[PDB]
Amino acid sequence: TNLCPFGEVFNATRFASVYAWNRKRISNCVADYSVLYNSASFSTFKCYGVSPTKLNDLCFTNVYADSFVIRGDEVRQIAPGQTGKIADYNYKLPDDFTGCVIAWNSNNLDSKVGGNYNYRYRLFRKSNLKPFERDISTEIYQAGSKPCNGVEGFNCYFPLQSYGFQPTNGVGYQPYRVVVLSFELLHAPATVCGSNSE
Amino acid sequence: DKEWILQKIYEIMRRLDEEGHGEASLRVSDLIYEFMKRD
Numbered sequence: 655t656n657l658c659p660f661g662e663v664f665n666a667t668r669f670a671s672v673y674a675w676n677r678k679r680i681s682n683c684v685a686d687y688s689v690l691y692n693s694a695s696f697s698t699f700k701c702y703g704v705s706p707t708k709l710n711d712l713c714f715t716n717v718y719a720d721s722f723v724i725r726g727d728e729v730r731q732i733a734p735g736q737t738g739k740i741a742d743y744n745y746k747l748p749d750d751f752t753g754c755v756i757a758w759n760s761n762n763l764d765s766k767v768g769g770n771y772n773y774r775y776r777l778f779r780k781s782n783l784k785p786f787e788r789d790i791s792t793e794i795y796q797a798g799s800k801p802c803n804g805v806e807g808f809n810c811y812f813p814l815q816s817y818g819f820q821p822t823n824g825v826g827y828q829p830y831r832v833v834v835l836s837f838e839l840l841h842a843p844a845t846v847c848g849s850n851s852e
Numbered sequence: 853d854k855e856w857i858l859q860k861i862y863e864i865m866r867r868l869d870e871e872g873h874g875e876a877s878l879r880v881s882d883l884i885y886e887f888m889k890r891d
């Protein structure tokens with residue numbers, strides 16, 4: 655009966671920073687994925703299982719919607735098998751991902767004259783993230799031979815950096831809002847069904 | 853070791869930000885990432 659509240663995700667006023675990406679569980683509702691696909695101008699809308707139209711005949715236990723902001727030239731890392739600053743240290747998709755990755759330019763909401771400092775990314779980490787792992791820690795990172803003891807200094811860095819988005823950036827360095835839809839199929843009665851299911 | 857040059861590149865990244873060179877700072881950040889991946 656209920657229509658799935660994709661609007662609460664895609665139309666949120668503020669998005670999460672990628673290092674602390676947000677996840678919303680979508681359950682117990684009817685989802686029209688073709689209407690979502692057509693709901694706005696997207697720069698990326700790449701599904702790794704089936705297409706939106708084909709999604710509309712499918713039912714899932716839950717749908718997860720992960721959202722955050724990155725640079726336009728980083729959206730390519732939100733994909734199975736990719737490496738880079740974002741895929742390694744911030745948000746990692748599994749090699750067997752079969753959901754959808756959706757993105758759009760948000761220069762008009764997430765940039766500021768003089769630099770927006772609300773959005774940050776992790777620049778340093780001792781190891782790469784596991785798929786769907788989330789690291790919100792802020793331990794001073796030991797880049798050199800000597801321990802940091804919790805104090806910033808020589809080769810001892812705060813692990814997050816601000817994007818500093820300014821509207822005059824080149825488009826590859828402009829902010830993009832990203833939504834990743836994961837389609838969960840447990841051994842369970844479905845709770846999220848497409849518009850043309852059954 | 854890379855300790856001195858890593859620190860200098862880190863410091864330029866931070867200075868470029870404070871001076872509003874927000875996009876130049878991101879280019880330096882990318883280099884820090886690639887540099888630190890190397891042995």
Ligand SMILES: *[C@@H]1O[C@H](CO)[C@@H](O[C@@H]2O[C@H](CO)[C@@H](O)[C@H](O)[C@H]2NC(C)=O)[C@H](O)[C@H]1NC(C)=O
Pocket residue numbers: 660661662664665690693
């Ligand atoms: C995000 O917000 C926009 C703006 O309200 C929604 O677009 C409207 O959708 C309704 C129903 O489909 C239409 O009747 C309006 O004409 C749309 N307005 C515009 C300006 O396109 C959009 O549906 C929302 N996104 C999601 C995923 O819910």
